[PDB]
Amino acid sequence: DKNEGVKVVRDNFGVPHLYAKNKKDLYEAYGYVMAKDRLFQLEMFRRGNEGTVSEIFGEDYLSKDEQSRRDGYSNKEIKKMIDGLDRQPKELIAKFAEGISRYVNEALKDPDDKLSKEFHEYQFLPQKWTSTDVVRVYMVSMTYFMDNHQELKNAEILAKLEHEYGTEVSRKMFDDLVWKNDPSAPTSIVSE
């Protein structure tokens, strides 16, 4: 639970095919090859959930940084929730952050050749990565597909229709616009 060693084969399209002797090493190299390929993108995706994009790109993204923090979690809250994981997932996520951090160090030692142009243009440096950062980069995207306030947009549509047509007619339109059922909608499940 301390030795190491992983081979990395890059195909004609640059995809890394990793070959380890245990998962702890596999998931360390997993995070390394990805940082080597997408360091700035990973930096900025973490910054999205952390609410730190305005540090780099200005007040245009303040509203976004403000939303990801009022709905997000602190570091302690995330560390608490990572601590509630099973043994193996918790450790492989950590080794994943170590893999990313491995390349971050490698880039800071050879910035001209291993640090992407975005860091040079906007002159800032990538930060090291812990398991919290990996979870944040997961939250920045996956939560976008479940987070919304369409309920409040539905109440707005219903109100403007009520101030125009009255309660009787307004609810009829709304039940057609935002319906409750629609029994003829195509489905994915059909035949047991």
Partner: protein, 527 residues
Amino acid sequence: SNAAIVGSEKSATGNALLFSGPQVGFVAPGFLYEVGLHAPGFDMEGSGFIGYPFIMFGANNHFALSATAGYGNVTDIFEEKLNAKNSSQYLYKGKWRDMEKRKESFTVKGDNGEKKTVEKIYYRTVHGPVISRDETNKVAYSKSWSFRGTEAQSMSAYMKANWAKNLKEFENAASEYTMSLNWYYADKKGDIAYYHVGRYPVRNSKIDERIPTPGTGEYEWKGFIPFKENPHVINPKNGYVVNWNNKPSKEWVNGEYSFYWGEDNRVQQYINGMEARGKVTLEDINEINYTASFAQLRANLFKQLLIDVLDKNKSTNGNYIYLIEKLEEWNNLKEDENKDGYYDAGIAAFFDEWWNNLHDKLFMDELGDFYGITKEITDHRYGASLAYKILNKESTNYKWVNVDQEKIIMESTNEVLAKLQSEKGLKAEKWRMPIKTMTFGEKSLIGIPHGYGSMTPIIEMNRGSENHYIEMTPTGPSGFNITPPGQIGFVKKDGTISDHYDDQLVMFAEWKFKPYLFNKKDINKAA
């Protein structure tokens, strides 16, 4: 996001199939990261969203898997009632309750390249963070995530899905995943399965799931639906499962997002392709992906409603004989197979404007002053369910049209054709529009700039940001895939992009694919 899994009986080769197509946008660096993971007892090749230490689209030794994000109901808004004497208190179960106070500071690079710090304070209720207030009157709104605090557990559940060695272990992982996704599964032994994962709350039956829930404490959630009640199916008799953001099952309800799952849904493009064929192959799925990527979605259902009306008035308007002919001839998609600068079927241009003209003749009078907030419903990206039910003589709660359906269909035909005959030409060849192009930009769905993108124009396609075509043969996963724009997003300090920064775009545009690699023998021959 689309997907498709096929059973052994519905598969030509006999082996199960799987097809991936997540629509997470087109950006450079791409939204996905391809990888090949190998270790004793673990061999998995595929791609996942940038950042995730697990594969979502691909296969391991035992099964292929894929996912599709959608518009499930795991987020409820609660309408808190505030205390007139104290804005920081809301009525909850017969008593005033103090909200939480969270202080946050943001550093900002202002207009002058020097840092700038702004202080903000956000409040949280029992239901979650407050997102809006209303001084008219004494009301505030909070957001309840059905998955709050469980994002980490869903990571492990997805990683556990990677490590699964059979369906039981894969289903156990889907049991633990707490957020709203659709999971897809195909075995080396011909079995396929579909799961609408996510922990879905048990809501009060006396409230309206389309609008915010009162937060007084008498309409709260009461646990989470057991996983066994989520939509799912193991080896369905029809032989396959397709999806493109639609109703999972007749029984499943959506609430705020009902207008995404209607009688006119774009998934019908994938159903049409599976039903028109017998036992299918990967290329058949690729063929359906092409159709889907260029389909004039309105033409799937409305063209027949149009051709009919024109046929019943074939004798009263000389132009209708021609329109009928060109409409029956056209294959309902806007493509550029001839590789010129224009789409191949000018009648699609007529049909485009016919719909636009038709849509307004239905809703302009009553919803015209609200198109900014309702047109995305009535002219929805995935279909026009309401409009179809009106023109199809189906009963509606409100009486939208005050005339006959054929009169409007002809009023739209005549006005559009009249405009096209005087401004362009008398025949369809002169109506063809120039193709619409797209580029892999710098800003993702999440809204942040993560790179420099690409200026390369490629034809617009209603296609997934990535595609996998996997056949689970008795020897292991097999097939082909494509992950544009490229694997490496690195850009040297002097501006030189990685040789693998855009080397997959042309193939993505020219519908060519690279081979899906799994065993070590093939991966060495690719290096």
